Paper text:
The co-crystal structure also reveals that the N-Methyl group of 1 could be extended into the adjacent pocket to make additional interactions with the residues lining this site. To test this hypothesis, we first explored simple N-alkyl groups such as cyclopropylmethyl and benzyl groups, which could potentially extend into the side pocket, but they led to a significant loss of activity (data not shown). Therefore, we explored extended linker groups, starting from the corresponding methylacetamide derivative, which was synthesized according to Scheme 1. Compared to 1, the corresponding methylacetamide derivative showed a ∼4-fold loss of binding activity. In the co-crystal structure, R1155 moves to open the side pocket. The carbonyl and NH groups of the amide of 9 make additional hydrogen bonds with R1155 and Y1189, respectively, compared to 1, while maintaining the π-stacking of the quinazolinone core with R1155 and W1182 and hydrogen bond of the carboxylate with G1154 and Y1184. The co-crystal structure with 9 indicated that other larger amide groups could be extended into the side pocket to further improve activity.
Author numbering: 1109 to 1207
Write the structure that this text describes.
Amino acid sequence: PLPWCPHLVAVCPIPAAGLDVTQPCGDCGTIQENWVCLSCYQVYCGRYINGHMLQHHGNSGHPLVLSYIDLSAWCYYCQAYVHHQALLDVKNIAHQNKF
Ligand SMILES: CNC(=O)Cn1c(CCC(=O)O)nc2ccccc2c1=O
Ligand SMILES: [Zn+2]
Ligand SMILES: [Zn+2]
Ligand SMILES: [Zn+2]
């Protein structure tokens, strides 16, 4: 992945409730291929399901989303995966909830 991107500044603190990697899409309710927004921690489906996270990006501008399938982080602006020290806490919390 990219080792940095200029949107990591928009990654917000993890809610104290933690993450729920089985949370369904906030729009369509699908259990499949959901992502969590690393700005506001809403959960929406991937582009191969109904594209609600892509829609969320379009109407919020929020840059970085984490996959509940493989804990990769995508930046919609950079059109790339990004991994940095600043993402370890949220990935670690997701990994603990998933496994
Ligand atoms: C399996 N990983 C992905 O699909 C990564 N990804 C993603 C991930 C986030 C998503 O599916 O909304 N979004 C894109 C949006 C427009 C264009 C490309 C992409 C993109 O390649
Ligand atoms: Zn959806
Ligand atoms: Zn968001
Ligand atoms: Zn970026």
